[PDB]
């Protein structure tokens, strides 16, 4: 069977992009995901029915000094539910944008989980992230994660790529 | 240091949300001073004075 949900509907300068992801199932268990991407070429200013749902790159912020722990604890969008000391925290988050013009976001709902790596290799969620605003110009949680922490990146790149086969046999 | 860093963080958070286009308008346009070389003949008092 097949289940698919629509993610991105945004009025680009070139038209109305539409992204859909299809989680294909097999006896209930999902097997693979297909992400397609169309484009209603042309021009569209329906900034009301446009939106976007994106999952954030899991960022790993490291707390070393004592202000850092207070830095984010000041962030009303940050909200920890366990009073356990932590050294480094991984932030796995997702957002939901709703646009009002080319670049103003009529709404941002960005919820996500903060995770702590124990020496027992058991990862326990310290708390949640709950941001919510209107008519904004960026996702503060993502920005704060970017400059103050590095992401758990998976696509590690060589400094020099290698050609697999050389010639015209392709 | 924490009152410094939390201030910096909440400043930049606002500069992102509100956008960097209005935050410059919160900083008041101060006035640069020039020199005002006059010549200023000695000041005449009033007659009755």
UniProtKB/Swiss-Prot annotation, chain A:
Signal peptide (residue range): none
Subunit structure: [Alpha(6)beta(6)] hexamers of two multifunctional subunits (alpha and beta).
Known role: Fatty acid synthetase catalyzes the formation of long-chain fatty acids from acetyl-CoA, malonyl-CoA and NADPH. The beta subunit contains domains for: [acyl-carrier-protein] acetyltransferase and malonyltransferase, S-acyl fatty acid synthase thioesterase, enoyl-[acyl-carrier-protein] reductase, and 3-hydroxypalmitoyl-[acyl-carrier-protein] dehydratase.
UniProt family annotation: Belongs to the fungal fatty acid synthetase subunit beta family.
Protein name: Fatty acid synthase subunit beta
Species of provenance: Candida albicans (Yeast)
High-level lineage: Eukaryota, Fungi, Dikarya, Ascomycota, Saccharomycotina
Gene name for this UniProt entry: FAS1
Stretch of the intact protein here: 1359 to 1528 of 2037
Swiss-Prot record, chain B:
Function, in words: Fatty acid synthetase catalyzes the formation of long-chain fatty acids from acetyl-CoA, malonyl-CoA and NADPH. The alpha subunit contains domains for: acyl carrier protein, 3-oxoacyl-[acyl-carrier-protein] reductase, and 3-oxoacyl-[acyl-carrier-protein] synthase.
Subunit structure: [Alpha(6)beta(6)] hexamers of two multifunctional subunits (alpha and beta).
Family: Belongs to the thiolase-like superfamily. Fungal fatty acid synthetase subunit alpha family.
Protein name per Swiss-Prot or TrEMBL: Fatty acid synthase subunit alpha
Organism: Candida albicans
Gene name linked to the record: FAS2
């Amino acid at each position: 069977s097949t289940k698919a949900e629509i993610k991105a509907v945004l009025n680009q300068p070139s038209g109305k992009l539409v992204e859909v992801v299809g989680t294909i199932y097999r006896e209930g268990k999902p097997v693979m995901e297909v992400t397609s991407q169309f484009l209603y070429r042309g021009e569209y200013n329906d900034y009301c029915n446009t939106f976007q749902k994106v999952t954030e790159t899991p960022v790993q912020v490291a707390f070393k000094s004592a202000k850092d722990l207070a830095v984010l604890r000041s962030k009303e969008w940050f909200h920890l539910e366990k009073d356990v000391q932590f050294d480094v925290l991984t932030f796995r988050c997702e957002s939901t944008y709703k646009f009002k013009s080319a670049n103003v976001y009529s709404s941002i709902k960005t919820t996500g989980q903060v995770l702590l790596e124990l020496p027992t290799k058991e990862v326990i969620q310290v708390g949640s992230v709950d941001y919510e605003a209107g008519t904004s110009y960026g996702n503060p949680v993502t920005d704060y994660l970017s400059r103050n922490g590095k992401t758990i990146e998976e696509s590690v790149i060589f400094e020099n790529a290698i050609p697999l086969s050389s010639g015209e046999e392709l | 240091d924490i009152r410094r860093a939390v201030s910096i963080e909440s400043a930049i958070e606002q500069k992102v949300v509100n956008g960097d286009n209005v935050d410059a308008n919160y900083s008041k346009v101060m006035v640069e001073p020039r020199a005002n070389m006059k010549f200023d003949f000695p000041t005449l008092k009033s007659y009755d004075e």
